[PDB]
Amino acid sequence: LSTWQTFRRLWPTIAPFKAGLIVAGVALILNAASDTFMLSLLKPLLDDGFGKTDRSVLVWMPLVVIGLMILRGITSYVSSYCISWVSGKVVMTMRRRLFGHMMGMPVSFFDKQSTGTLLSRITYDSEQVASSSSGALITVVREGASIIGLFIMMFYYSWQLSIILIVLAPIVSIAIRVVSKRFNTMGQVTTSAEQMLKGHKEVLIFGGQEVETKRFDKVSNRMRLQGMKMVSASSISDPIIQLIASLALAFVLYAASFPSVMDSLTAGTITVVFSSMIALMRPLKSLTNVNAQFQRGMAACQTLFTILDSEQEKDEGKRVIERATGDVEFRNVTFTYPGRDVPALRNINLKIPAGKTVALVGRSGSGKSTIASLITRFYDIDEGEILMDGHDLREYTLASLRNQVALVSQNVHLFNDTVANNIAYARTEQYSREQIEEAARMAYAMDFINKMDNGLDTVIGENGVLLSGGQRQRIAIARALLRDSPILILDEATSALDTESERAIQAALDELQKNRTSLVIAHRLSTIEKADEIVVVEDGVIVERGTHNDLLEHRGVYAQLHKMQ
Amino acid sequence: DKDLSTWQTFRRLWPTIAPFKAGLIVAGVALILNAASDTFMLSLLKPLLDDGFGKTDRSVLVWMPLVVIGLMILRGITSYVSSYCISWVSGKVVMTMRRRLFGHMMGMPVSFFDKQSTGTLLSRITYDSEQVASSSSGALITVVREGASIIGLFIMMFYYSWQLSIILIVLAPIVSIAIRVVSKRFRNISKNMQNTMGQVTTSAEQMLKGHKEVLIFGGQEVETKRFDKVSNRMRLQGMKMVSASSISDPIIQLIASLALAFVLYAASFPSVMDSLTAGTITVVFSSMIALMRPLKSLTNVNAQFQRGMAACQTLFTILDSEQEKDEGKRVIERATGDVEFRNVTFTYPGRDVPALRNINLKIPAGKTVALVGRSGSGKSTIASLITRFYDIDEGEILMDGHDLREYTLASLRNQVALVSQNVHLFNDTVANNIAYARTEQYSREQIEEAARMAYAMDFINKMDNGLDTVIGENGVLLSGGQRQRIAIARALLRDSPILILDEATSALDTESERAIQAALDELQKNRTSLVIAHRLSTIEKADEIVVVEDGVIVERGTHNDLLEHRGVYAQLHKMQ
Ligand SMILES: *O[C@H]1O[C@H](CO)[C@@H](O)[C@H](OC(=O)C[C@H](O)CCCCCCCCCCC)[C@H]1NC(=O)C[C@H](O)CCCCCCCCCCC
Ligand SMILES: C[C@H](Oc1ccc2ncc(/C=C/C(=O)O)c(C3CC3)c2c1)c1c(Cl)cccc1C1CC1
């Protein structure tokens, strides 16, 4: 029921190209016939060819075989080009549909699943569905035409032998069933090696090389034993299946011996009746496995309809702000991550007056990073109110709201393009290269850019292979600087502070934070002390706050928190 | 070039394979007998047509069905055997390669690991070593099985109708050249799509991973329009991929179809058809047809074999990489712990600013020293150097009056205990984590007291199975404040003479830190200590405090003396 209902959810995507499937379909039909017409000629070559008629061996055969193969070769080229064309069109339509849909999903959708899983949905599953269905379509028709093309030729040239094979087919069918039914370690290998490379530091001291080598020996030998097992199982099945089929066909030949049968048979008749019986062994093998591949094709497809049926983040705000030099205010905000029942943030009131930088410090796991995630509306809240310019964040459209925020973090993912186009990301045409180039030196990122071979027009290549942890940060700063966003969110938990030129990064932040609202998950001592207000978060609550005469002494946790970092 | 680069690389791998040569020898004999079953069955067509239909019922009846059944049994056995033998030889060689790679990576420099992602090494050794066997195995099976059958078929063609065979042979070279040219023209474009698919991968991965900056910076169109382009080129290249073989396959068998028709156009002419009979033509032509698949498989062996050696080389380069330099030749059992830096300067690999310069400091046995200074300096670097993770550039680091590099890394590193919050917790029992590599040397009562003296038993006694609970699974079960106490339990048990204590990454925000402070006190009563200090407790009791900035020791003294002095140290006291 499901297996076929999914395909019918999929057919609409295919229907614009059905024009390619039928043309392929006929190309398949004529291919089976051409292969059937050559087993046909096998009788005139033997009987007529050696019934004292060199007429047939010179005329009939050498030129009809070349004729049939041209037809055979063109039908193959055509069906191949149609299926491939249709198969290409649907995978593209689907990859594109999932790319757009997944991109519009909320961050809750990305938390559950791996990024590679969602990427597998686009790269492989989308291709496996058309692969499994195309082959399904080919086998149903191509070998469905051959099987009837061959069965006719069988009975016509000798009804006696054919009906002896058919009566045996039920028993053979049941026999191939019982044997085809008799048709973790890899995870341990990857783990045993990964946690070795993880603890290489701890393996050198304590001298664990020995216990690690023999831990691996076990794990590597166990997967080798599982590896041989699967092939061994697979190996034996077909030899038996061939044996079974050979028995029945042998019995059919012991039948041709009887004088009533042999008299009807010539040298050619039997040669084609057994050549066509043998030609039936591949179509039968294909036609029995075809619904198993259609299943796996549609199971991968309902996976993607599960994704496509998922709902994109809700953007019902109908309010637009050109630019907001203004404060962000939390009004008794309480938040709980979906799937968790203990609020990450309890009753919280926080004010970030315009132009001022509020550095919030907190324990590594606390909901300090949850605060900067709520302002950008990665998640909607359960109770309370967050006001930007005295109006709820949910009042605004999400595009306008996020135009006011700029994110800066080491882990800011850098996309595959020029340095310059990363800095002017999604606004390349807006900013002149002079505007770009200035933002680069104002971020102290130029010190390493000119070292690059083409400098600013050098392209970050192969998924970001060239840049270092510290380098990305100064490009993230240049991106926010150039865009000049009213609200600055600065992630310093992921910063990787120990760098070759940290003083360069620090002054950049100095320039960026200035005359600009800034909300920083701070780990650095310098960005902390030269910040307008400090805010401590303990679990879901704010324990104590303080300015500059309060920075001298805090009532709550600051003394122990500062002492640790 | 590549037939040489592959063949010299193969002669590198044969040492790994030769211990299983017996498996190869057997597999091949079966493959031989496998190809003869197919050759001997096509011969059965001649007596069937000539005698069985030359008015004799014995041939078709009694034995003809028996023999074919027998031949199939032989085919099935030769099949299964060769398959099992190859799958056995491969499994071994694969496993062996892994143990060689694994063993070699464990002994690599620390620079090799901080620089390379852990994954890329892990993926290659599991994937490549399997490809080296798959490609090599398939190559062997072809040269033997199909190389045997072409012989078997060539002979049978010459016995039955010595004449027809030669016409095929004289046609062979031009048919061969005809086929090779057609083949080289079209089908060699797998990489063209690999590039295009890579761009589908990159764009999709960039969008999915960097999903949060796309939303903030509003690059949905720039990402969409980019995936619209690349996905189409991927689509197009997929078709150019099939069109390669959709065009090349029908052309090639047409070329071979001509050559056979000309052999069949001679079958009509009188000189040779007279001697021959209807039963010999069937076995001669079917043999020529049976020759087509073997000839296809063989001429594609180099492509298969060279590919396998192209992945075996990537495993050989990693093996050729230089391992940790280790020429000490000196072994020390329970060093005293008299560590002294003399004129040490050092720059991390690839950087151009030394992490340390003209460092001179002395750490006498049984006494602690605290290294405090601006975060991001080389105090961490100092700790790294005593374990030989990195060799200094200039100067010398002495352990009991001898340069560390004089010592065996094994002996040198058994002297050093490391305590920090970022210790690795191997997924295994708590007891076996406390006695990591010495489960055989330390009794249970020995392990029990080490955890007790580390003040860790409160959170161990709360475990599911207590001390035999399995911590690990990459460490979820243990908090940071609890990692230290396990790290401390390791050091108490082994009782190493030189302690490296890192509170930098440690968390003083722990419900039980007075218990962590008591464990630390008991730990360092005995031995030399080198603290990257960040706690009031340790700098309070430390024997010497050295202030480090920019890889230079600018002030050395006791906590009180430096406060009487009240210079740079007092500034830090005011700052923290
Ligand atoms: O698709 C190819 O690979 C698969 C994987 O094994 C093969 O099964 C497949 O072969 C079959 O599909 C062939 C089919 O089972 C039998 C029908 C084709 C014709 C068989 C011979 C007829 C005798 C004609 C006498 C006049 C593979 N495709 C090849 O095997 C295709 C096959 O070789 C067709 C090309 C044959 C060339 C014809 C030359 C005739 C010369 C006559 C002189 C006596
Ligand atoms: C007597 C025999 O009747 C079956 C019936 C069902 C089968 N269903 C599947 C398979 C193969 C399965 C596989 O390869 O997994 C076979 C054998 C022909 C291979 C089957 C043979 C047979 C042979 Cl022998 C050769 C040609 C035709 C038939 C029957 C008339 C259909």
Ligand SMILES: C[C@H](Oc1ccc2ncc(/C=C/C(=O)O)c(C3CC3)c2c1)c1c(Cl)cccc1C1CC1
């Ligand atoms: C006359 C003709 O001589 C070649 C020579 C080299 C070949 N080398 C490769 C291939 C196939 C390549 C592929 O499929 O990519 C073929 C065709 C017979 C298949 C080749 C045919 C021929 C045919 Cl016709 C049939 C059987 C034997 C031969 C040769 C005389 C031994």
